[PDB]
Amino acid sequence: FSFKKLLDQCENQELEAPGGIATPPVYGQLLALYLLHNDMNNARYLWKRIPPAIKSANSELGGIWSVGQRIWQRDFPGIYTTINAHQWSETVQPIMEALRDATRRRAFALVSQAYTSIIADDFAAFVGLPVEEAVKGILEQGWQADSTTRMVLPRKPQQLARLTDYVAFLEN
Amino acid sequence: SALEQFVNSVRQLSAQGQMTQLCELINKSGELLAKNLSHLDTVLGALDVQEHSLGVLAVLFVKFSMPSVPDFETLFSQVQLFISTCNGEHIRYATDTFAGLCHQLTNALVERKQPLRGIGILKQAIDKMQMNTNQLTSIHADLCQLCLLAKCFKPALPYLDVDMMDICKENGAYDAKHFLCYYYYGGMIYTGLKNFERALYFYEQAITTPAMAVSHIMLESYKKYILVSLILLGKVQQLPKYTSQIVGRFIKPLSNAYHELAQVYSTNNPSELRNLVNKHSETFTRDNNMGLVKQCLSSLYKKNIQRLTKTFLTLSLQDMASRVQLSGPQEAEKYVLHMIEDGEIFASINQKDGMVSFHDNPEKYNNPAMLHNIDQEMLKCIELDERLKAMDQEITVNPQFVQKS
Q: Cα–Cα distances in Å, from B288 out to B166, B232, B285?
């Protein structure tokens, strides 16, 4: 629930500024929050909104955009690869951990809905877990796995007041 | 004693309660205010920005009316303070000057490098200018332009999600340029947000504006109307009958690269479409809409895949890639998976047999959630009917009406 206010407070801080340019630390917070909610349209325009002087001075903004670039092309293995490739500051560390976990639920829902049978090697890349781990995870959720083929088979497991409003409108 | 007397001359107009003569004084004191140069103490010391909003509006507008201002940092700060502390009710008595002041600020901010600082200024300016949120002012175009040059599309969303009803005349200072710019910049704002349903609506309004002379805004809106209708829909949507004849006789000939692009789009052959894009690359990049045309190429593949659902229950990935010209079963698998994620298609991928099965079962229209959707649309129609009935009741009580009936 706390993620609702954090995104709004960073957006407002960018709107009003003492000199029209916001602080470097709040730029990374806004970019990370956009990626957490899968709002890639505003994140992409935020990258162009960052002045080149700020982007060149702070290398953190370049790194956070690398993670977003993977999400933009829907490169699931690259989302986990770039998240752990670099070390982030403490003010955006907890939300970026939530971004990595949020990507994990996105992969789980995508496989459960868009796949009737997915090979284990590709399925492990989607979730971001090692191949052996992904084998043990599915049975805990009831998903069937078959040996000698290494293939996973996922499957998805005031009316009265309103009505009198309709009549009153029609009868005037 | 004499110094306070000059302020007291303002009090007589307020005491009488007639604000009409105060407005006339503002327009008839332009020469006296122009030859002052000492407005630094007039804005705050001479008059109070809270209740003497009319007086402070005139001096600030005069300051912005002088090209090559010696100082801009103090001028921008005074405008920000005045608009933030505007009375609101009396501002509507000087609508032509309030809008003109916002136009001057917008041009100054746009000119150098900073069309971002005024986004919050124009947000409050609109709120203290329009009679209701369901109304269109000239500051709407400026707010959209500021949100466009700074690529901050979210602050303009609350001012674009409301359907405008009646247009503020601002004492005759409202012209068709402000109407065209709002529905052109606002349409491009929705395009950047991948909202092609409302972007197409906004472009259509600009085209349907009555006109007798060629307008650049109406020309570009026609060009982007074709591209958006080719992305959201599979064809160029037909314009309304009340479109001005100039659009179909001048604007259409000037937009020929986009018309032949639609014709190639109708053949459902991506390789021909890419040939026309390369042939007319200079035309599309000159018009600055590069990327919208590339989205037409990607949407053709989605349109072809969606046609497969109208004929197949199960199609091999290799066979599908040969019909949609994706050149590879791996490419077809990625294209189909993205469509399922976005909800554009109802299908599943089976890697055991390398087949894609289309499950054409959208909804049974039985769940209680469908009931909620029905009453949401019903409430929209009821509110639409209430506005329609109310506005004709304004016609009946019109003295000009019933005299001619």
A: 32, 20, 5
